[PDB]
Enzyme design. Structure first.
Site, PDB file in Angstrom:
ATOM      1  N   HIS A  66     -34.182  -0.530  -0.563  1.00  0.00           N
ATOM      2  CA  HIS A  66     -34.497  -1.225  -1.808  1.00  0.00           C
ATOM      3  C   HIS A  66     -35.896  -0.903  -2.366  1.00  0.00           C
ATOM      4  O   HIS A  66     -36.285  -1.411  -3.423  1.00  0.00           O
ATOM      5  CB  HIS A  66     -34.219  -2.726  -1.705  1.00  0.00           C
ATOM      6  CG  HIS A  66     -32.947  -3.120  -2.385  1.00  0.00           C
ATOM      7  ND1 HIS A  66     -32.897  -3.499  -3.710  1.00  0.00           N
ATOM      8  CD2 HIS A  66     -31.666  -3.120  -1.941  1.00  0.00           C
ATOM      9  CE1 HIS A  66     -31.639  -3.735  -4.046  1.00  0.00           C
ATOM     10  NE2 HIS A  66     -30.874  -3.516  -2.990  1.00  0.00           N
ATOM     11  N   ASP A 130     -35.576 -13.526  -4.279  1.00  0.00           N
ATOM     12  CA  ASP A 130     -34.635 -13.771  -5.382  1.00  0.00           C
ATOM     13  C   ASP A 130     -33.276 -13.135  -5.143  1.00  0.00           C
ATOM     14  O   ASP A 130     -32.265 -13.618  -5.644  1.00  0.00           O
ATOM     15  CB  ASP A 130     -35.178 -13.202  -6.695  1.00  0.00           C
ATOM     16  CG  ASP A 130     -36.421 -13.910  -7.171  1.00  0.00           C
ATOM     17  OD1 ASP A 130     -36.662 -15.057  -6.740  1.00  0.00           O
ATOM     18  OD2 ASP A 130     -37.211 -13.390  -7.983  1.00  0.00           O
ATOM     19  N   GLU A 243     -39.955 -20.978 -10.614  1.00  0.00           N
ATOM     20  CA  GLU A 243     -40.264 -19.670 -11.172  1.00  0.00           C
ATOM     21  C   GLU A 243     -40.391 -19.795 -12.684  1.00  0.00           C
ATOM     22  O   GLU A 243     -40.331 -20.900 -13.237  1.00  0.00           O
ATOM     23  CB  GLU A 243     -39.201 -18.637 -10.772  1.00  0.00           C
ATOM     24  CG  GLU A 243     -39.276 -18.249  -9.301  1.00  0.00           C
ATOM     25  CD  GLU A 243     -38.507 -16.987  -8.954  1.00  0.00           C
ATOM     26  OE1 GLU A 243     -38.336 -16.742  -7.743  1.00  0.00           O
ATOM     27  OE2 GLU A 243     -38.084 -16.243  -9.873  1.00  0.00           O
TER      28      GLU A 243
HETATM   29  C1  LIG Z   1     -33.798  -3.869  -4.564  1.00  0.00           C
HETATM   30  C2  LIG Z   1     -34.551  -5.128  -4.932  1.00  0.00           C
HETATM   31  C3  LIG Z   1     -35.683  -5.468  -4.180  1.00  0.00           C
HETATM   32  C4  LIG Z   1     -36.212  -6.765  -4.201  1.00  0.00           C
HETATM   33  C5  LIG Z   1     -35.594  -7.740  -4.988  1.00  0.00           C
HETATM   34  C6  LIG Z   1     -34.471  -7.408  -5.748  1.00  0.00           C
HETATM   35  C7  LIG Z   1     -33.945  -6.116  -5.722  1.00  0.00           C
HETATM   36  C8  LIG Z   1     -32.663  -5.856  -6.467  1.00  0.00           C
HETATM   37  N1  LIG Z   1     -36.092  -9.031  -5.021  1.00  0.00           N
HETATM   38  C9  LIG Z   1     -37.206  -9.368  -4.269  1.00  0.00           C
HETATM   39  C10 LIG Z   1     -37.727 -10.664  -4.293  1.00  0.00           C
HETATM   40  O1  LIG Z   1     -37.264 -11.504  -5.063  1.00  0.00           O
HETATM   41  N2  LIG Z   1     -38.843 -10.974  -3.534  1.00  0.00           N
HETATM   42  C11 LIG Z   1     -39.451 -10.006  -2.757  1.00  0.00           C
HETATM   43  O2  LIG Z   1     -40.439 -10.275  -2.075  1.00  0.00           O
HETATM   44  N3  LIG Z   1     -38.941  -8.728  -2.735  1.00  0.00           N
HETATM   45  C12 LIG Z   1     -37.827  -8.395  -3.484  1.00  0.00           C
HETATM   46  N4  LIG Z   1     -37.336  -7.100  -3.452  1.00  0.00           N
HETATM   47  C13 LIG Z   1     -38.208  -6.022  -2.862  1.00  0.00           C
HETATM   48  C14 LIG Z   1     -37.898  -5.861  -1.378  1.00  0.00           C
HETATM   49  O3  LIG Z   1     -38.521  -6.899  -0.648  1.00  0.00           O
HETATM   50  C15 LIG Z   1     -38.360  -4.488  -0.891  1.00  0.00           C
HETATM   51  O4  LIG Z   1     -37.538  -3.489  -1.462  1.00  0.00           O
HETATM   52  C16 LIG Z   1     -38.384  -4.354   0.637  1.00  0.00           C
HETATM   53  O5  LIG Z   1     -38.698  -3.021   0.964  1.00  0.00           O
HETATM   54  C17 LIG Z   1     -37.085  -4.759   1.336  1.00  0.00           C
HETATM   55  O6  LIG Z   1     -36.070  -3.811   1.085  1.00  0.00           O
HETATM   56  P1  LIG Z   1     -35.289  -3.108   2.309  1.00  0.00           P
HETATM   57  O7  LIG Z   1     -34.899  -4.140   3.295  1.00  0.00           O
HETATM   58  O8  LIG Z   1     -34.107  -2.307   1.765  1.00  0.00           O
HETATM   59  O9  LIG Z   1     -36.404  -2.186   3.016  1.00  0.00           O
HETATM   60  P2  LIG Z   1     -36.621  -0.618   2.701  1.00  0.00           P
HETATM   61  O10 LIG Z   1     -36.829  -0.406   1.254  1.00  0.00           O
HETATM   62  O11 LIG Z   1     -35.494   0.251   3.269  1.00  0.00           O
HETATM   63  O12 LIG Z   1     -37.980  -0.377   3.516  1.00  0.00           O
HETATM   64  C18 LIG Z   1     -39.234  -0.760   2.989  1.00  0.00           C
HETATM   65  C19 LIG Z   1     -40.362  -0.392   3.946  1.00  0.00           C
HETATM   66  O13 LIG Z   1     -40.338  -1.222   5.097  1.00  0.00           O
HETATM   67  C20 LIG Z   1     -40.125  -0.450   6.269  1.00  0.00           C
HETATM   68  N5  LIG Z   1     -39.135  -1.144   7.118  1.00  0.00           N
HETATM   69  C21 LIG Z   1     -37.820  -1.428   6.837  1.00  0.00           C
HETATM   70  N6  LIG Z   1     -37.288  -2.092   7.891  1.00  0.00           N
HETATM   71  C22 LIG Z   1     -38.247  -2.248   8.829  1.00  0.00           C
HETATM   72  C23 LIG Z   1     -38.254  -2.849  10.083  1.00  0.00           C
HETATM   73  N7  LIG Z   1     -37.138  -3.367  10.606  1.00  0.00           N
HETATM   74  N8  LIG Z   1     -39.423  -2.842  10.816  1.00  0.00           N
HETATM   75  C24 LIG Z   1     -40.574  -2.249  10.327  1.00  0.00           C
HETATM   76  N9  LIG Z   1     -40.557  -1.656   9.083  1.00  0.00           N
HETATM   77  C25 LIG Z   1     -39.415  -1.659   8.350  1.00  0.00           C
HETATM   78  C26 LIG Z   1     -39.668   0.931   5.811  1.00  0.00           C
HETATM   79  O14 LIG Z   1     -40.061   1.970   6.686  1.00  0.00           O
HETATM   80  C27 LIG Z   1     -40.281   1.049   4.429  1.00  0.00           C
HETATM   81  O15 LIG Z   1     -41.598   1.542   4.504  1.00  0.00           O
HETATM   82  C1  LIG Z   2     -38.675  -7.772  -7.014  1.00  0.00           C
HETATM   83  C2  LIG Z   2     -39.011  -9.235  -7.120  1.00  0.00           C
HETATM   84  C3  LIG Z   2     -38.199 -10.112  -7.741  1.00  0.00           C
HETATM   85  C4  LIG Z   2     -36.875  -9.763  -8.388  1.00  0.00           C
HETATM   86  N1  LIG Z   2     -36.278 -10.961  -8.957  1.00  0.00           N
HETATM   87  C5  LIG Z   2     -35.110 -11.019  -9.648  1.00  0.00           C
HETATM   88  N2  LIG Z   2     -34.708 -12.226 -10.111  1.00  0.00           N
HETATM   89  C6  LIG Z   2     -33.579 -12.359 -10.829  1.00  0.00           C
HETATM   90  N3  LIG Z   2     -32.806 -11.300 -11.130  1.00  0.00           N
HETATM   91  C7  LIG Z   2     -33.155 -10.063 -10.711  1.00  0.00           C
HETATM   92  N4  LIG Z   2     -32.436  -8.909 -10.963  1.00  0.00           N
HETATM   93  C8  LIG Z   2     -33.208  -7.954 -10.332  1.00  0.00           C
HETATM   94  N5  LIG Z   2     -34.336  -8.470  -9.721  1.00  0.00           N
HETATM   95  C9  LIG Z   2     -34.266  -9.831  -9.989  1.00  0.00           C
HETATM   96  C10 LIG Z   2     -40.300  -9.733  -6.503  1.00  0.00           C
HETATM   97  O1  LIG Z   2     -40.891 -10.732  -7.329  1.00  0.00           O
END
Ligand SMILES: *Cc1cc2c(cc1C)nc1c(=O)[nH]c(=O)nc-1n2C[C@H](O)[C@H](O)[C@H](O)COP(=O)(O)OP(=O)(O)OC[C@H]1O[C@@H](n2cnc3c(N)ncnc32)[C@H](O)[C@@H]1O
Ligand SMILES: C/C(=C\CNc1ncnc2[nH]cnc12)CO
Ligand SMILES: *[C@@H]1O[C@H](CO)[C@@H](O[C@@H]2O[C@H](CO)[C@@H](O)[C@H](O)[C@H]2NC(C)=O)[C@H](O)[C@H]1NC(C)=O
Ligand SMILES: *[C@@H]1O[C@H](CO)[C@@H](O)[C@H](O)[C@H]1NC(C)=O
Ligand SMILES: *[C@@H]1O[C@H](CO)[C@@H](O)[C@H](O)[C@H]1NC(C)=O
Ligand SMILES: *[C@@H]1O[C@H](CO)[C@@H](O)[C@H](O)[C@H]1NC(C)=O
Length: 479
Positions: A66, A130, A243
């Site tokens: 993500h 979210d 929010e």
């Molecule tokens: C896609 C997106 C992201 C998102 C969101 C809504 C959408 C549609 N809403 C969020 C929200 O409301 N609040 C918030 O804090 N974040 C929100 N996100 C962003 C999301 O937190 C980030 O994308 C985050 O990276 C989590 O995504 P994901 O689980 O898919 O992790 P990744 O992108 O593949 O990796 C990100 C980094 O972290 C390291 N990583 C991943 N897993 C681990 C573990 N198990 N241990 C140590 N490190 C880890 C990866 O290497 C990378 O650097």
């Molecule tokens: C990436 C983060 C929030 C995303 N919040 C969302 N909140 C509501 N709808 C959505 N559609 C895509 N992203 C969203 C961190 O504040």
């Protein structure tokens, strides 16, 4: 040792799948992808990395990819397909504690599954994101923010302990009581120090339902003051979640309808309101109260506020339905092919003292006269609920705002330029913001992000836990 067992894949389909992310802007092919069946496979990889002179590969841990700008890539390295840890039926990767006071979750597990398992035992995590299709390890490596964070802190403030395999290939259990240095580093640590294979998450008795409100403003000062009122310490007020969102005039009707909250009739009323006041920007507080008693409690809270009379909009839903609200948005948008698009998202934390200035320069300024697609989210957070000893970086003020401008994209180049312009405005205005979910590309920017003291600690932990600088190279801190 792994590849023959089929775990380390080098085929084109495997590498391609681990070479793109949600951001859909940057790409980087890995040399290999590990599909671990157990934590032992991760220990094996990291132990090999640690013990081998001339070890060639950086290692990234893909949660669900993500990331917006390649944070989960390992260019010419090894991406770990973390999801593989949850393939086996037994043993379970999510365990609610015997007394129901916590839930143990695999680092690869997605928060939607954590919720489902918790609810089966009558409990639920207190602090969310979210959007629920994100991994435990992934959000904890950043912070994990949503509307509960003002009162419970981010997800990193709701972890009791973790199992981490460091860059030395050592499996370590860490908490405030044991290996606290690793515990603190890993939380908000951007995957730099080791992989979270298990996290112990705080839970609370699960509420059944949520009274869910949106309040409309044309006045930013009244909007932000009311947000700060709702989230102020007394212990906190009655609201479970707070929010807000911003709606620019040009795409007002469209963006209001895109929330999924307002009916077409509701939208027309708000457009008419904005019209009569010649407002260039409309603001909405989004709040919930988890639970006739609700009616009076809500009425009491709303009576402290200054939203436009006639513009309180109410929904009443099951708690789980509220938490998973964005999933429905994804399903609908994906059908129209509007989900899997470039996402030049801008996320930052803006100090309270400068939020009005930000509104003037960005919402009333830069963003005016454009067709905005995607939410513009703005809401206050309380620094008291954040642990500054953890790696996550926040502004210095007691109150700062989450600002999440979630642009969906010739549109891409325009939006990328727009984001540069917003940052330029902030820099010139001297706003001491911190980015969130963004990676920086040089040393000075990263040092500025963390600040001098926190940077030096970050480096100390890097030398201790990932001295070869292998882990999560896509953050571009040590790579
Ligand atoms: C896609 C997106 C992201 C998102 C969101 C809504 C959408 C549609 N809403 C969020 C929200 O409301 N609040 C918030 O804090 N974040 C929100 N996100 C962003 C999301 O937190 C980030 O994308 C985050 O990276 C989590 O995504 P994901 O689980 O898919 O992790 P990744 O992108 O593949 O990796 C990100 C980094 O972290 C390291 N990583 C991943 N897993 C681990 C573990 N198990 N241990 C140590 N490190 C880890 C990866 O290497 C990378 O650097
Ligand atoms: C990436 C983060 C929030 C995303 N919040 C969302 N909140 C509501 N709808 C959505 N559609 C895509 N992203 C969203 C961190 O504040
Ligand atoms: C959930 O609890 C179960 C215990 O029932 C854990 O399963 C054990 O896991 C260890 C190491 O991972 C194995 O050696 C055991 O054979 C498993 N025991 C059983 C009964 O299957 C599981 O690890 C827990 N999950 C998490 C993420 O903590
Ligand atoms: C973005 O997604 C499209 C599919 O719509 C794909 O063709 C393209 O390669 C992706 N770009 C990146 C850099 O991920
Ligand atoms: C890491 O490598 C060192 C040799 O540099 C070795 O002494 C140590 O035991 C290794 N640790 C693991 C768990 O592989
Ligand atoms: C809002 O935008 C529309 C065009 O979409 C324009 O007609 C109107 O003048 C704008 N209102 C204000 C007050 O800026």
């Amino acid at each position: 040792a792994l590849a023959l067992d089929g775990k380390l894949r080098t085929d084109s389909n495997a590498t391609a799948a681990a070479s793109t992310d949600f951001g859909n802007i940057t790409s980087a092919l890995p040399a290999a992808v590990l599909y671990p069946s157990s934590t032992g496979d991760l220990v094996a990889l990291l132990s090999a990395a640690n013990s081998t002179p001339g070890w060639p590969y950086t290692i990234a841990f893909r949660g669900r990819g993500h990331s917006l700008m390649g944070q989960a890539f390992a260019p010419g390295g090894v991406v770990v397909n973390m999801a593989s840890l949850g393939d086996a039926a037994a043993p379970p990767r999510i365990n609610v504690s015997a007394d129901g006071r916590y839930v143990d979750a695999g680092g690869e597990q997605v928060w939607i599954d954590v919720l489902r398992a918790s609810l089966a035992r009558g409990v639920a995590p207190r602090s969310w994101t979210d959007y629920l299709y994100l991994t435990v390890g992934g959000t904890l490596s950043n912070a994990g923010i949503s509307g509960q964070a003002f009162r419970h802190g981010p997800q990193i403030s709701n972890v009791l302990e973790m199992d981490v395999i460091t860059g030395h290939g050592e499996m370590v259990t860490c908490s405030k009581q044991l290996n606290a240095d690793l515990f603190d580093a890993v939380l908000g640590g951007l995957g730099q120090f080791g992989v979270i294979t298990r996290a112990r998450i705080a839970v609370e008795p699960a509420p059944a339902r949520a009274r869910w409100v949106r309040f409309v403003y044309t006045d930013f000062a009244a909007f932000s003051a009311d947000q700060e009122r709702l989230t102020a310490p007394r212990s906190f007020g009655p609201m479970s979640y707070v929010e807000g969102s911003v709606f620019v005039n040009q795409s007002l009707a469209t963006d209001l309808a895109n929330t999924g909250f307002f009916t077409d009739a509701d939208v027309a009323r708000i457009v008419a309101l904005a019209g009569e006041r010649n407002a260039t920007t409309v603001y909405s507080i989004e709040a919930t109260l988890n639970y006739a008693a609700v009616d009076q409690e809500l009425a009491s809270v709303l009576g402290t506020l200054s939203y436009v009379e006639g513009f309180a909009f109410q929904r009443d839903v099951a708690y789980a339905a509220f938490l998973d609200r964005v999933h429905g948005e994804e399903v609908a948008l994906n059908k129209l092919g509007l989900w899997r698009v470039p996402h030049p998202w801008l996320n930052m934390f803006v100090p309270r003292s400068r939020i009005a200035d930000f509104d003037r320069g960005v919402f009333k300024g830069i963003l005016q006269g454009t067709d905005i697609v995607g939410p513009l989210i703005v809401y206050p957070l309380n620094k008291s609920m954040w642990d500054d000893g953890m790696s996550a970086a926040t502004p210095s003020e007691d109150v700062f705002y989450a600002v999440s401008l979630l642009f969906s994209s010739n549109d891409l180049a325009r939006l990328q330029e727009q984001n540069r312009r917003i940052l330029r405005f902030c820099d010139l205005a001297g706003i001491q913001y911190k980015t969130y979910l963004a990676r920086h590309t040089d040393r000075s920017d990263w040092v500025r992000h963390f600040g001098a003291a926190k940077w030096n600690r970050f480096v100390e932990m890097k030398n201790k836990y990932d001295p070869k600088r292998l882990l999560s190279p896509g953050q571009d801190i040590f790579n």
